[PDB]
Design a protein around this nucleic acid. Structure first.
Lengths: 142, 103, 150, 17, 110, 56, 117
RNA sequence: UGUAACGGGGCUAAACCAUGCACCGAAGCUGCGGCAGCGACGCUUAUGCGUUGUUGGGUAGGGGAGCGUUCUGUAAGCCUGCGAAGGUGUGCUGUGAGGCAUGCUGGAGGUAUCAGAAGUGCGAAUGCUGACAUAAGUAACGAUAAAGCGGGUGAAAAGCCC
RNA sequence: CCCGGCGAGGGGAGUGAAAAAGAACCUGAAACCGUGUACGUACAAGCAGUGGGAGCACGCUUAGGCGUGUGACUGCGUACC
């Protein structure tokens, strides 16, 4: 018969906490994208957001191997005559340590309205504390 | 309480007392048909196929209708090459209702 | 087509399609690319082929019993009423009367009868034999047929 | 509906040789 | 009741009159009348005359009590256009369309 | 200076969305004669703030 | 024998426009544009009659892979175990079982693990 | 012009070398259902095949077989004012061009089957004629000699009369 | 007869088998322009479709779907000659 399709209304989404201390940026980010997309669930549907809410703590403690800590450069254009701005990994960490983790996940997710929707589930914090204790955020070891 | 069986080259998962549409069969509309090629039978207890097609599992089914499927329009068009072609297709199907599933 | 050969407008400079005359076939009110002319549609048929078809037609009428041979067929007076009565008792409504000799009395009687035709053996055509449901031939009319058919 | 009559030269006399 | 009333072949363009029509759509006749009275458009007096006629038709040919009447439907449709020739520079000619319209107003007590 | 493609009726309506007129919806009633008139304007018969000002 | 083509031409145009119903703008109103839209829809329909089969195949594999991993085995290992165990269930049924009957899938992965070991 | 010499994220193995076992992956191959061409044989003998093997991407182009439109005969026959043609929807039907039945408008013509003849099929030709869009309620309203007020007429007056 | 400027145009009445046969008059298609109803649309990028597809609004037997309309989201996809 017709293949099962998850209905967005009747989807259960869980809350998890991931400690991002001493974790490789890319390998941690790759796992987060998988959970946010919902590919880990047997009811995964490409056109439905079946993912789960993920809280990431200690963003500033993320680790990178090699010289990426100083050689990795993030470029962004401001849409002006010469508005090309670059920041290294240290500069990003000092300014906004959470943004680097968000940038990594941003590029590991599909582009489109559904991709933006599942990205909004991620909640990255620089410190070790979060204000989402009312969501029963069970600890996820990964 | 459902079983999996192979009928027309594609497997079907049918529960008791439900109608399933499958490829045309050389059976009149008012005769029972047998499906001894049962891939899997599921119940409160689970039984699998150590050898394919279980050991004695059979499915009793009754033919209902021998209609044709919805018309499908096939269009072949080559851009700028002065070649256009049209065609139609209606696939034959057989509606069968599962009457009994053995063990 | 009535008109003049003057070019509607100059070849170049105008922003619209090149035109040569107001009478071009792709123009309104004047044209017809291949105009018809009075022609003869008559086609040749060999004498033997005409005779063979006529012989073939006569044989099959006999086979389908659509041909009835009788003695002299005549009407005493030029009255359509008499002819209608004579054909009524014979259960014939659409008949082609073929007689060896054409008499004005029979010709006038059947003139106003659409379903009835009166003809001579010489003036016999395949279409009339096929079209008419029944054909009645007199003894004299029969004889002239073989002579002309040979 | 009706063709114009003046039909001036719309092209500009400026050859790009 | 239907009690339709229309004015056909108005000289005003359908677009221009259609702005005035949207103002009074669905409103009561009492509020519609003074809204048009103080609207500074030519279409205002064209529509107002049609609305007056519709109210009169309802009062005379149909039931009375025009106080509780509303303009249930009002629409403007493009009418026949008159083609005119207007000379332009360099001997060219262009077509001027004098656009007309039909104004239809429907009022009912329910 | 001239369009390359004719705009649709959708774009035409979208541009015209701002052309809608607005009703005055601010008709005041004269103190004495009780005649509807535009605010800060004399009545049709020639009244303003109650007292007659036109006398014609 | 002059022949007028008004009736036939109008019939053909109506047939195309009927097939172009629901398209946006002139694609559903104008015949010249509607004919192109209808033809293109025909090409896409023919092409997507084949992409549908592979698109659903990918969806079933993703569902099986998620279910198998949840049971503690990779998709590639799980399928290999079934082949070794002589199980002819295809992806469509496997994905259907995983979504609905978790116990049946648990038995399948257990059977696959035994065959591999 | 802007990272801009992995497609990107990102990777210290998610790079490279050697070996191995898995899996994904096309309209390829196989399975199931259906259609058509060609060559054989068992038999029907102007046709089905209990069958058999194989073929079926296609421009220029060659070959074969068909649909539909107007008119002629069949036809003073047949359908039709308890409703023809045309128009507009819907539902069936054929591998196709198409066909059939019917709701509403329409108001008096239409035509089976089988043959015959073509002004026999349009999306393009800066095609021709008409109708209607677009730009757009945009530019402009034709000498920068100039108007203001009172009264009159009128449904209405900056433009008419005083 | 009524609205209107002793207008235009219209609503009644009447004539007629029929007045969406009213002289702008048989039939009255398409482009084009409107009013009403259902659904969608103001954080989302491209030949505007196609495959999958939730929700909503209408009807049908059954109480599960089937049909009709719309169509969020998603894979693929750069008109014709």
């Amino acid at each position: 018969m017709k293949t099962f399709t998850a209905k967005p209304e009747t989807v259960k989404r869980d809350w998890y906490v991931v400690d991002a201390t001493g974790k490789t940026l890319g390998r941690l980010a790759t796992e987060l994208a998988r959970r946010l997309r919902g590919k880990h669930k047997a009811e995964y549907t490409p056109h439905v957001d079946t993912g789960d809410y993920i809280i990431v703590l200690n963003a500033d403690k993320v680790a990178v191997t090699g010289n990426k800590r100083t050689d990795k450069v993030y470029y962004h254009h401001t849409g002006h005559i010469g508005g090309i701005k670059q920041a290294t990994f240290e500069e990003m960490i000092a300014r906004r340590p959470e943004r680097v983790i968000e940038i990594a996940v941003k590029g590991m997710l599909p582009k489109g309205p559904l991709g933006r929707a599942m990205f909004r589930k991620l909640k990255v914090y620089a410190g070790n504390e979060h204000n989402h204790a009312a969501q029963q955020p069970q600890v996820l070891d990964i | 309480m459902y079983a999996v069986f192979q009928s027309g080259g594609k497997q079907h998962r049918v529960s008791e007392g439900q109608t399933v549409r499958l490829e045309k069969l050389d059976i009149a509309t008012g005769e029972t048909v047998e499906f001894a090629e049962v891939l899997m039978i599921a119940n409160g207890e689970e039984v699998k196929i150590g050898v394919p097609f279980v050991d004695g599992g059979v499915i009793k089914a009754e033919v209902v209708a021998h209609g044709r499927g919805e018309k499908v329009k096939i269009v072949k068009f080559r851009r700028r090459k002065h070649y256009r072609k049209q065609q139609g297709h209606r696939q034959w199907f057989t509606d069968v209702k599962i009457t009994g599933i053995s063990a | 087509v009535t008109g003049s050969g003057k070019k509607p407008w100059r070849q170049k400079g105008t922003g619209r399609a090149r035109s040569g005359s107001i009478k071009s076939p792709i123009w309104r009110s004047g044209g017809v690319t291949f105009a018809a002319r009075p022609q003869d549609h008559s086609q040749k048929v060999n004498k033997k082929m005409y005779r063979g078809a006529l012989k073939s037609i006569l044989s099959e009428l006999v086979r389908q019993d659509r041909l009835i041979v009788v003695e002299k067929f005549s009407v005493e007076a030029p009255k359509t009423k008499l002819l209608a009565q004579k054909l009524k008792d014979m259960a014939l409504e659409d008949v082609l009367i073929i007689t060896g000799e054409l008499d004005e009395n029979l010709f006038l009687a059947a003139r106003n009868l659409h379903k009835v035709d009166v003809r001579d053996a010489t003036g016999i055509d395949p279409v009339s034999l096929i079209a008419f449901d029944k054909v009645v031939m007199t003894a004299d009319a029969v004889k002239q047929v073989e002579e002309m058919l040979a | 509906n009706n063709r114009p009559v003046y039909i001036p030269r719309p092209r500009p006399p400026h050859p790009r040789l | 009741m239907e009690t339709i009333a229309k004015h056909r072949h108005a000289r005003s363009s359908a677009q221009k009159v259609r702005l005035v029509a949207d103002l009074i759509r669905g409103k009561k006749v009492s509020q519609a009348l003074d809204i048009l009275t103080y609207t500074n458009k030519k279409a205002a007096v064209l529509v107002k005359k049609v609305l007056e006629s519709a109210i009169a038709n309802a009062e005379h040919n149909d039931g009375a009590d025009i106080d509780d009447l509303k303009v249930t439907k009002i629409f403007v449709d493009e009418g026949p256009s008159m083609k005119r020739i207007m000379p332009r520079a360099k001997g060219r000619a262009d077509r001027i369309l004098k656009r007309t319209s039909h104004i239809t107003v429907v009022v009912s007590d329910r | 200076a001239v369009q390359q493609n004719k705009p649709t009726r959708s774009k035409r309506g979208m541009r015209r969305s701002h052309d809608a007129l607005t009703a005055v919806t601010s008709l005041s009633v004269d103190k004495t004669s009780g005649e509807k008139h535009l605010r800060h304007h004399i009545t049709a018969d020639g009244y303003y703030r109650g007292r007659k000002v036109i006398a014609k | 024998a002059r022949v007028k083509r008004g009736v036939i031409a109008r019939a053909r145009h109506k047939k195309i426009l009927k097939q172009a119903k629901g398209y946006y703008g002139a694609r559903s109103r104008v015949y010249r544009v509607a004919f192109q839209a209808v033809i293109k829809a025909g090409q896409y329909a023919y092409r997507d009659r084949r992409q549908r089969k592979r698109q659903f195949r990918q969806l079933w594999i993703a569902r099986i892979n998620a279910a198998a991993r949840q049971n503690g085995i990779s998709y590639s290992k799980f399928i290999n175990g079934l082949k070794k165990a002589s199980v002819e269930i295809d992806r469509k049924i496997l994905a259907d079982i995983a979504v609905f009957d978790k116990v049946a899938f648990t038995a399948l992965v257990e059977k696959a693990k035994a065959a591999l070991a």
